[PDB]
Design an enzyme around this catalytic site. Sequence first.
Site, mmCIF file in Angstrom:
data_model
loop_
_atom_site.group_PDB
_atom_site.id
_atom_site.type_symbol
_atom_site.label_atom_id
_atom_site.label_comp_id
_atom_site.label_asym_id
_atom_site.label_seq_id
_atom_site.Cartn_x
_atom_site.Cartn_y
_atom_site.Cartn_z
ATOM 1 N N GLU C 4 0.109 4.067 51.265
ATOM 2 C CA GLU C 4 -1.311 3.744 51.338
ATOM 3 C C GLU C 4 -1.846 3.542 49.920
ATOM 4 O OE1 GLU C 4 -5.310 5.131 53.926
ATOM 5 O OE2 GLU C 4 -3.390 6.163 54.248
ATOM 6 N N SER C 24 -14.041 12.146 57.276
ATOM 7 C CA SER C 24 -15.288 12.359 58.014
ATOM 8 C C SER C 24 -15.547 11.117 58.941
ATOM 9 C CB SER C 24 -16.445 12.574 57.041
ATOM 10 O OG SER C 24 -17.683 12.756 57.711
ATOM 11 N N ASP C 34 -7.986 2.206 58.112
ATOM 12 C CA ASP C 34 -7.561 3.026 56.961
ATOM 13 C C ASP C 34 -7.896 2.412 55.643
ATOM 14 O OD1 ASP C 34 -6.392 5.236 58.417
ATOM 15 O OD2 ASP C 34 -4.702 3.914 58.877
ATOM 16 N N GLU C 47 -4.470 -0.840 59.155
ATOM 17 C CA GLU C 47 -4.279 0.423 59.856
ATOM 18 C C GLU C 47 -2.855 0.908 59.564
ATOM 19 O OE1 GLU C 47 -6.705 2.121 60.934
ATOM 20 O OE2 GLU C 47 -6.002 3.548 62.446
#
Lengths: 117, 120, 125, 115
Positions: C4, C24, C34, C47
């Site tokens: 990532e 959150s 993401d 994602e």
Amino acid sequence: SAVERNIVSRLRDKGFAVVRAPPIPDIIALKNGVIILIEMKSRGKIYVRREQAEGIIEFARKSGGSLFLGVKKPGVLKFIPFEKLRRTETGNYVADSEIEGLDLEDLVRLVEAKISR
Amino acid sequence: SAVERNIVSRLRDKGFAVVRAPDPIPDIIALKNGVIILIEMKSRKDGKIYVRREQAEGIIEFARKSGGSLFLGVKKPGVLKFIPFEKLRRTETGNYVADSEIEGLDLEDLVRLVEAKISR
Amino acid sequence: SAVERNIVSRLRDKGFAVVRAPASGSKRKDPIPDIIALKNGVIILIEMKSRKDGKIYVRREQAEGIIEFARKSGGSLFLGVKKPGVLKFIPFEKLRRTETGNYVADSEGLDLEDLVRLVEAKISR
Amino acid sequence: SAVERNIVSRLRDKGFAVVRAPPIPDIIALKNGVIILIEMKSRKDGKIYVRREQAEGIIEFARKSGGSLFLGVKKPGVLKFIPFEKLRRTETGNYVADSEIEGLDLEDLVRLVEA
């Protein structure tokens, strides 16, 4: 005729079922349910008259296909997604011939990746 | 040709983007909301539909590559009839045959078949 | 996370404004992709998902929410394969919907360069 | 936070894909390829102050993304959005704007988007 014939031959080599127009886009290329509509243009700005633009937009809308302008320039083969053109006050369609577009290989890569505008 | 012209006009009335072939290309390519329909004009001789191997192979290949649905457009006056290519039988030599009571779809049923596919 | 981070850094090197989705959020309902990468009107959504026993599974509610975010935004949605080596991105439209509405990636996607060039060549200007 | 939550909810009701973010704008809202960026800021005697540091980072995000930058006024009642270009830059480089600069309401923000 020669550029158009070369496009048809190269799309066929890539596994597309291809037809030329006998309102109708110049080239209709089909692969695994994916519809690609090509309108050939010669230009140093891309201009598509209202009546021609409306007819090809309508064919694209009805077919559910993706419409592209095939911009043939010496040493250049670029496909411009129709949505990038600007509609003028009187309904004509314009864009700079240097606008970001796809070459043949990228267009085919776009069809396989299942990506449309 | 008059039947072909009528088929093109009637598919256009039903909202299809239609093109006629200018051959290993179906006579009619009809497109609607991502759905590909291919129509080969074939007359019924002695009540039989007889598609020679070379013609069949070319149209079956265009159908396979495109992902489209193949039909035989019956070259007759009156009520339009479309025979799904899958109802034909492949002979020992690779020809394709349809008998007397292999009834084709009328125009309305063909459009209803496309609609069901459009919504998929 | 390292994959990532590697994706975020390379998109940034290519001139993209990149944001991660907050912890959150992604609350089964109203999931957020993401990675959101933006460059002069071009929206790329990624994602992250791991390869498990061959395939890649995206649960119905997560898939539906990311599909909806992509559709509303006008962005291009991809599955970023959480694996070492070659960054591979699967266009969301290549996934198949299962009987229960989940999404699966079988077996090949785009590398970073192809993703970027193809998406920019498609919608830029 | 309640104002931020209300902005996110109203934008979602209007068909936007919204991220209430984790130099990054507080809210990133996306619709049909259009990017809207919102930085939440409090009023002080009808004035909104943005420190040169924060301002530069959000301007850079807006430049790179190709998005439109606005200051979301932290106030109760009717939502007000100040276009970042309405911010008068100071001698020290800090950005200042009046809370009643005729800042956009939510619909006018949605309209700029539908163009």
